[PDB]
Amino acid sequence: KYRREAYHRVFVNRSLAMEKIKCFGFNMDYTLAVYKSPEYESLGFELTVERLVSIGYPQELLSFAYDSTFPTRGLVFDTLYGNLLKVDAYGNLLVCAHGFNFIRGPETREQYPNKFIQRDDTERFYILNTLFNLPETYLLACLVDFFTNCPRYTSCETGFKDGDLFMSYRSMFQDVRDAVDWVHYKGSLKEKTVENLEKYVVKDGKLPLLLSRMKEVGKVFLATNSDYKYTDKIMTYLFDFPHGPKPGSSHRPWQSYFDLILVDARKPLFFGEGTVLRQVDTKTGKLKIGTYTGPLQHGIVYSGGSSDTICDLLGAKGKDILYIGDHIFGDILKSKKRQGWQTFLVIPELAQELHVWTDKSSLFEELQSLDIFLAELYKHLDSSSNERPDISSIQRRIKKVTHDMDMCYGMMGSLFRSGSRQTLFASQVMRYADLYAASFINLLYYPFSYLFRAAHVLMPHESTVEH
Amino acid sequence: KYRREAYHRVFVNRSLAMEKIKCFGFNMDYTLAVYKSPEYESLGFELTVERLVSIGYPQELLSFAYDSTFPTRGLVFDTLYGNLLKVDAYGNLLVCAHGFNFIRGPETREQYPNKFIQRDDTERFYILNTLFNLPETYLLACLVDFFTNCPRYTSCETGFKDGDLFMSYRSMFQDVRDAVDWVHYKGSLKEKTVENLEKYVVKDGKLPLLLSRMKEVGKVFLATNSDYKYTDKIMTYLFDFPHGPKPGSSHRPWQSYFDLILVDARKPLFFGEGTVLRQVDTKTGKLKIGTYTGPLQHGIVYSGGSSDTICDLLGAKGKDILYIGDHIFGDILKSKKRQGWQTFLVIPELAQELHVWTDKSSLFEELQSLDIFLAELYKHLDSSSNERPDISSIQRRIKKVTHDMDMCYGMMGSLFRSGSRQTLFASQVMRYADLYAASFINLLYYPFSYLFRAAHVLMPHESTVEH
Amino acid sequence: KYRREAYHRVFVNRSLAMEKIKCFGFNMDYTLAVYKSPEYESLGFELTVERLVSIGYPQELLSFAYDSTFPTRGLVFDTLYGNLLKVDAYGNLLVCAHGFNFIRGPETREQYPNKFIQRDDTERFYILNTLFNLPETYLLACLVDFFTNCPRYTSCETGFKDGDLFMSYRSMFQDVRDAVDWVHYKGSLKEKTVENLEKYVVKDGKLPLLLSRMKEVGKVFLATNSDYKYTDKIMTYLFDFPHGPKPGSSHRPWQSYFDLILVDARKPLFFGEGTVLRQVDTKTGKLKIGTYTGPLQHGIVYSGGSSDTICDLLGAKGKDILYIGDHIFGDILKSKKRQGWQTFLVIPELAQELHVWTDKSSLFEELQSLDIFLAELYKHLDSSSNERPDISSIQRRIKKVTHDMDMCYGMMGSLFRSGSRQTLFASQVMRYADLYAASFINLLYYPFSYLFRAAHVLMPHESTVEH
Amino acid sequence: KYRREAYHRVFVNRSLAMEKIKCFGFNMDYTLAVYKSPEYESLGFELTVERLVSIGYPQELLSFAYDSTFPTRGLVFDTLYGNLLKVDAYGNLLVCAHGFNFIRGPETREQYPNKFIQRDDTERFYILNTLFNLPETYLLACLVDFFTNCPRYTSCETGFKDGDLFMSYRSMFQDVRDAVDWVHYKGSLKEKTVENLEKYVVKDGKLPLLLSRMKEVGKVFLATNSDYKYTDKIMTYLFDFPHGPKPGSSHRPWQSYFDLILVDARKPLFFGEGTVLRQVDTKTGKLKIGTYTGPLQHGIVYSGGSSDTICDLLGAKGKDILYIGDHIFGDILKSKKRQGWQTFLVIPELAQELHVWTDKSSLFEELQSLDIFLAELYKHLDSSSNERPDISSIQRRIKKVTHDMDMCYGMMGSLFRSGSRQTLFASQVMRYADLYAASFINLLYYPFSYLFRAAHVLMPHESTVEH
Ligand SMILES: [Mn+2]
Ligand SMILES: [Mn+2]
Ligand SMILES: [Mn+2]
Ligand SMILES: [Mn+2]
């Protein structure tokens, strides 16, 4: 079967007829504005450590340097025990690292009955799904690791003693949750991003190309959580080329690419009741007291609003809308809110994941062989056979190799799978995302008539027995 | 790769080393005692209809004949709208049946906001998961269909006018809930099973052979929900052969195969608090005055108890126990109760579903040809090229062929999937079962040294890109 | 101030000028047709018990005798714990009865977190508001009590073991819900009422006198939920006197008193969408082939319809209509449906409750003496003085005397209050009813020019400080 | 019966034994810290207008001067129509003012079907319950009034046109909700309060007196939403006297009056799950990284936390706690959260209310007379009488007089009642408050042994018929 080159591919959870698509919606941060890596994470990391120091934390935090090779996205911080957990779709622990000390085997079960956590218990466990969580994730490890090995800190099971005062991982987590939040919304993160854009944000003429062709088959809108001063800066840079969509054409403003522009969306509340629909005065970047209602002329820019409001202005309905973004949402209203958008989920980790999947075929093959052999020793055996062939050295070599394969993805494994088992993150992707790729940009390699036909997912009795 | 024949396979969700199994636990009903189909469904069906009529439902209910080709296990009854729903792992409706009229396409949105249900509502939706639910599934369809088309009944959104009386589907469903309950627990269902065991229950000497071999390598126990009177009749019939485990050998009683036997288990409550541990007078079948607990001397038959008590009585830890059964439980206590068994789930539908996967390969292969060709019509295309090639006709042949395939399994399709999407049921199997096969009997084809290595389950970007 | 005798009074929640009333609407059942007590309760009680037994409840249910001294109208059945709850306007438990054992003091907290229920849960709690609910109230108590104390039944938190069967209170309640429904709508309850009208229904010539006088000053209509067959029997019995309105005058048919008559009203649905407006063939009692709508010529008897259609047929606006009845509705459409009637609510308990307020004044006055004295023991005291005067004994005499008072109204006390706190029922009366009396008949003592001026309802700082 | 002087009285909704009280909890803002009136409201008003001007609103807003005689607490802003509504306990409109134009009579019904609003519809209606709402309330009127009469503004039904731009009352309301919030939490409101304390906050040596006696019979805690820098300033001023509790005694720090001090409570979330329990470093007023757990020694000061945490540290249970405050809470968790505090609700408006109730007895009397007379004209009348005595001039004089009585409380009537009918605010008081007074300070006139015995609330048939 013909398939495009792996790195251009859009992958398909649920089938989707692109001719049917009338409106393309865009997330900005980490979707059109891909922040550069590991620079941007380093930036967030350092400002968060500097905020933690300024509010009391010890100076050794300034020795911390963000390491992009530790965190995998989607881990669970357990504020009871201070652990970064990699669980599966149902709650089973696949990885448990205390600080940087990976708890391997039976001693996990000591803390976690049945190697199992009830991931609905959000008072105890915080999911770290988003791309911005990456620094917070490495940081939580650094903090747990440092205090655990710092002689002036007595480690107990839920935190650390220091004389009369006790700092629990729950208190420690909230300080980190505050700092992070403070950095995003009151620190210099936006500011220092906007003043060295070439170091932090990607630029690529494929962005104005693809959006322009999208605008010839349908409408294009932007629904971003950032304000207008931030969005104007970021979007001006992404469209700063000495031409427009194609070489030779005049450059045009980034606004000219969107039928509707909405900032201050307040997602996910955006997707329910919303906030009052407001309008931004594009000169001050402040909200106008008035708001222009009616037709959909260009030059207007909205703040607040609702999915319904955006859908009414565009004159669409949910299934006419392909929402393109890096965030995974719930369906807490899908059973009442009659309107339901399609989804394209951006998953940047896929780029390096696909490199491992190809550039490391020797480990996938050699696992295939150790399983061939295994399935051969037991060939002529049934329950009558009482032979116990030694397979320890084999069972050893499968661990060492699937661990090697794991570590190709970094110290916390693949985003989508630990060893054989799938992650909780993979399931949310399969639940939420009709389409997904490493960047939406890969839509450029598909015609807008394209029929995306879902990939079959097989249960064991389907993947391992022939027709 | 070498694989055992499809109909002897045990399938592996999570990997398992059998050499580490020190106890084999058995469900009785629909595990060891496979009731014959469609006879046993019919017998429950007719007694339930007969119980309903004896409380006032019209005499036309007696014209019903149970029909095995309609129900698929695991469907959801909507008590609001009187519909049988086949949903996916996340709540997406795959199939809506009001009685026998299948709601196809857009008028499902009319009743279900995004073709979606919030299946966490155990006041509106009822899962029909179990093999005993099959009659009650088909009954619900018949009842809603009859009152819909009976001229003397006015049909409403949420029920029927029965003259001056309003019969809500929810009130009608609880009537069917109580009748099934009453028939199983107080009617003639058990008695009419015992007095014609050959008509209702499967027999096979493979059962004592296997259980004899399990007792060579580990302890063996029976934890059933039935009473000892019924359990003696059933287990004695199943072991009525003019020889013991092998041919030529002396027959031994069915008790002799179990180091522990437990009736009145009251699962799932069994698996948490439980009930008081009782001891059955094997003679009367009534409970003893006390309970001689202590040594594991076979001859004692317990009533009630808890998972905890079995493990103590057998002197074993959870991970030593492989619990063999046909019921899917939830991990509601997995995060606290330090003891957690391994599981083998018996899924009988697998036999005839494996038949369709093999004797209907004309359809799988043709759908694949329609997918090779589809991919070929778009080989040289991109967002640049604006050809709109007509695919509607071939896009019609894919519907008819996936409908034909879905219909190879009955009117509600495969247990595990609808066309391409996986069923809620498939995912509950995935969460619960370490191993699964059409019958537990299939263990007989594997050495008890076997390493069951799990099947890789691929995401779209895994199944669709090469190494 | 001059007031009419207590037993002739009409009480005023919201003020009303009768001279502005242009239509008088009548509920039939338990308004115009006051069923005799305890005979009619008994007759429904015995048929419901007899319906339950015919579907499998034990024969001891036939030993039950309906007992008028137990139930108070407006109680809440908890389907979880099988309790009859008397709560206040905000959800505070005043009284908890498991069967006939009254839960007093601290073990109510054991079942109810703050002696409180979230009465918005129409899946767990059921309000028993209506005069037809009285039998079903007492029945629920008997049933829970019998299975609690019957030796062959094991009692659980949420139900009973009926041998191998679990009978939940919720499942037991819906059985009683359907039986009452069936008895009213399909059993012999109506027929056994018609064939001994003198035993079951009150008669009084004050009824035609009043309705004759209303027709002098305004239009008059009947909007009942019963059918015309039943309505003819009932209304003809009520008007069977050997004279018309006054003595000496010629009798006239019961129809002659109504400008419009409406059966099969299907209230409350009547009050919104409604049903199609139908016309009854007065001869057969079956529906005509069509409906001759138009002029208001008396002789036409309608079926179905809506509040809207009555107003159109009478050519009147809501505020012209005074709806006389015994049922309390909710303001679920009051904020949109521009049409809203005035209301007179019939509360029969008021007769004997007015008796206790007058013939038990020995108790009210003594409680007041205990309050004068209590206030006297603390006259010269403040946060300065630290005397702790012993009041426990007098604080005991206040309990026994408020219990004695509460018991002057039956085992569940007054309809409107428990000791000092007001009942949920009292506040629903307050929300719904403009006027209220023990019977609508009491209008007869007021001129149709009367200005009903509302009673001031004082807050503590109003009732307890002088001008 | 003996009663203390009206202005010293504590009023009693539900009975409460003060000997039973172990812990006294305190709200700060508007409870211990009574802000002076109308100065403090003026202050908030002006800063909010200045914030509205700075973000775009027209300069004429600076002409606004806060008028304390317009707002009554507890009104409903309807963002659809821009109306301040005074409704009753169930949704019935008692007052409707558009800006300063009081809609009186039938034209209300044009906008409000049945003079009724569904007050649960919080997307449309905002309740203005709190003391801080007073300026926002007057302001909403000023804004609606100004734009309505400003020639350059075209008034429509849901807002105002100004050429191409439309400003809806919903957009207008959110700007006011923002400004207000901004003033409280980022403007100079706290700041300018703290720098002229003698103009804004009341001081009274009865505060340290009463708290000291409370500390001799039980524990005292503070649970305030303000931070520690604000709380220290405010509390130091309230206890700035040249003595301690009594004349002649040494002054002691305000902290010495509390066993537990909690700031940053985040009520009402405080009363559910809470926030992490933190500790404040009393020198910086910033949060310590550590937190001291264990005994309850003085010198420690908490931030965040939970009702449960405060209750555990104090070693109490809900009914041991009398929570003293000016805010009215819901019981959204009262049906699950096992712990439930008693309540003392501070209602400052009561001071002036009680002056009207006494200093204006001539209007209450003259209404009593017009009702005596009314009840006399209709004395010798029944339904036989067809006399229509003219009572228009009387019915006129009752309106003019109950309007005069109303206006003694200000332009929007009493806090607790409009004319005869009670307000929605009065009902929440009766639901939430076990005790209430104009200031908690009145506890000083009651012994701590005092039994507060609820005031009887009477239904019409109880207040108007004798024993
Ligand atoms: Mn984003
Ligand atoms: Mn079973
Ligand atoms: Mn009625
Ligand atoms: Mn306050």
Coordinates of C-alpha atoms in Angstrom, one line a residue, chain D residues 17-136:
Chain D
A17 CA -27.5 26.3 73.9
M18 CA -24.6 28.5 74.5
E19 CA -23.1 26.3 77.3
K20 CA -22.6 23.8 74.5
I21 CA -20.4 26.2 72.6
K22 CA -16.6 25.3 72.7
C23 CA -15.1 27.3 69.8
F24 CA -15.9 30.8 68.5
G25 CA -14.8 31.5 64.9
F26 CA -14.5 35.0 63.4
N27 CA -14.9 36.5 60.0
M28 CA -12.8 39.7 59.9
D29 CA -14.0 42.0 57.1
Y30 CA -17.4 43.5 58.1
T31 CA -17.5 41.4 61.3
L32 CA -14.7 42.5 63.6
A33 CA -13.6 45.1 61.1
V34 CA -16.8 47.1 60.5
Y35 CA -16.1 49.5 57.8
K36 CA -17.5 53.0 58.4
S37 CA -20.5 54.1 56.4
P38 CA -21.0 55.8 53.8
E39 CA -17.3 56.7 53.7
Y40 CA -16.0 53.1 53.0
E41 CA -18.7 52.5 50.2
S42 CA -17.9 55.9 48.7
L43 CA -14.2 54.9 48.7
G44 CA -14.9 51.7 46.8
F45 CA -17.3 53.5 44.5
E46 CA -14.8 56.1 43.4
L47 CA -11.9 53.8 42.8
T48 CA -14.3 51.6 40.7
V49 CA -15.4 54.6 38.6
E50 CA -11.8 55.6 38.2
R51 CA -10.9 52.1 37.0
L52 CA -13.9 52.2 34.6
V53 CA -12.8 55.5 33.2
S54 CA -9.2 54.4 32.7
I55 CA -10.3 51.4 30.6
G56 CA -12.6 53.4 28.3
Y57 CA -15.8 54.5 30.0
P58 CA -16.9 58.1 29.5
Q59 CA -15.7 60.9 31.8
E60 CA -19.3 61.7 33.1
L61 CA -18.8 58.8 35.5
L62 CA -16.6 61.0 37.6
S63 CA -19.7 63.2 38.3
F64 CA -21.1 60.1 40.1
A65 CA -21.3 60.5 43.8
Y66 CA -22.2 57.4 45.9
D67 CA -25.6 57.7 47.5
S68 CA -26.1 55.4 50.4
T69 CA -29.9 55.9 50.3
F70 CA -30.5 54.0 47.0
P71 CA -29.2 50.4 47.3
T72 CA -30.6 47.8 49.5
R73 CA -28.5 44.7 49.9
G74 CA -29.5 41.5 48.1
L75 CA -30.9 42.8 44.8
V76 CA -30.7 41.0 41.5
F77 CA -29.1 42.5 38.5
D78 CA -30.6 41.1 35.3
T79 CA -28.0 41.3 32.6
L80 CA -30.6 40.8 29.9
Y81 CA -32.6 43.9 30.6
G82 CA -30.3 45.9 32.9
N83 CA -32.7 45.9 35.9
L84 CA -32.1 45.9 39.6
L85 CA -34.8 43.5 40.9
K86 CA -36.1 43.0 44.4
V87 CA -37.7 39.5 44.3
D88 CA -39.2 37.3 47.1
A89 CA -38.2 33.9 48.3
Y90 CA -39.5 32.2 45.1
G91 CA -38.8 34.5 42.2
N92 CA -41.7 37.0 42.2
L93 CA -40.7 40.6 41.5
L94 CA -41.4 43.1 44.3
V95 CA -39.4 46.0 42.8
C96 CA -38.0 46.6 39.4
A97 CA -35.9 49.8 38.8
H98 CA -34.4 50.5 35.4
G99 CA -31.5 52.8 36.3
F100 CA -33.3 55.1 38.6
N101 CA -36.7 54.7 36.9
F102 CA -38.9 52.4 39.1
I103 CA -41.1 50.3 36.8
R104 CA -44.4 50.2 38.7
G105 CA -47.3 48.0 37.7
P106 CA -48.3 46.4 34.3
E107 CA -45.2 47.4 32.2
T108 CA -43.1 45.2 34.5
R109 CA -45.1 42.2 33.3
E110 CA -44.2 43.2 29.7
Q111 CA -40.6 42.4 30.4
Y112 CA -41.2 39.7 33.1
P113 CA -43.9 37.1 32.4
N114 CA -46.0 36.7 35.5
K115 CA -43.7 39.3 37.3
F116 CA -41.5 36.2 37.7
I117 CA -37.8 35.3 37.2
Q118 CA -36.1 31.9 37.5
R119 CA -33.4 33.0 40.0
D120 CA -31.4 29.8 39.4
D121 CA -30.5 31.1 35.9
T122 CA -27.1 32.6 37.1
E123 CA -26.0 33.2 33.5
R124 CA -28.6 35.9 33.3
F125 CA -29.1 37.1 36.9
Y126 CA -26.5 38.1 39.5
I127 CA -27.3 38.2 43.2
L128 CA -25.8 41.2 45.0
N129 CA -25.8 39.7 48.6
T130 CA -22.7 41.0 50.2
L131 CA -21.8 44.3 51.9
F132 CA -19.1 45.0 49.4
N133 CA -21.8 44.7 46.7
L134 CA -23.4 47.9 47.8
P135 CA -21.2 50.2 45.6
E136 CA -21.5 47.9 42.6

